[PDB]
Amino acid sequence: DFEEIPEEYL
Amino acid sequence: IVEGSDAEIGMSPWQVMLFRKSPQELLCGASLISDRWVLTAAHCLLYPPWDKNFTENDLLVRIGKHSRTRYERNIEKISMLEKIYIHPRYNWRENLDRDIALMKLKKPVAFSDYIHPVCLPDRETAASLLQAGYKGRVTGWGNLKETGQPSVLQVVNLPIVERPVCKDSTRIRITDNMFCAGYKPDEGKRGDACEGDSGGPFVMKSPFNNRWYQMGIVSWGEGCDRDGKYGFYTHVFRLKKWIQKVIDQF
């Protein structure tokens, strides 16, 4: 259960 | 990490999390050796027996972390990979000899209280410190038991083991590019790396200059924290000429 990372890094 | 404890804030500011973009998950540990270079185990990126062959665009590195699963806003930094370099004689077919890889980041990471590189050993520091009984430190977000997962980075200190004992603990062929560490059954203390910790650092604090040096990379083990088994680590100094060649060229 990882917290979503900012979209900018994807 | 089995039988370790929670890291202190900023205790291992070179610790890196190798993170898969999709599905979003922990892949391995790693370490920061400069503002643009990260060191890990080759098997974290390339292991054909299990159809593992990650490319640069598959992965991110997360630096400055403490919590395993949280996005640590204003603290951690997330970097994209420019290029992966795997040791050309990494032996994935047999015994993971030369289990080492470098990752160059697309942009330099900013150092902070939580982000700072570890030193790589010179010949003299390696000769002085890589002795049976001398303890190093292993850190990671891997599982807490062989058969669950930590809230925050875990830390365990473990003694280097005599080479004959390492060899006599396993049927695998041990090479000069490996060392082993961990307590013996009779020693009454325990601890080991486990799944998710591989690629992370085995560090020692030099008593000569009070700096932390990465002597090993978490490479392989037979189970986790089993009596009579030991963790095996890539011997960083023995492979340092390759590291230097890669950084100098690229």
Added chain:
Amino acid sequence: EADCGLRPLFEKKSLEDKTERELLESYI
């Protein structure tokens, strides 16, 4: 690299972490 291995929240402040002494005591 000049500053490698010196942690901002420990060596740079002259603070010790809770278990580094265990390492030093093993370096006999």
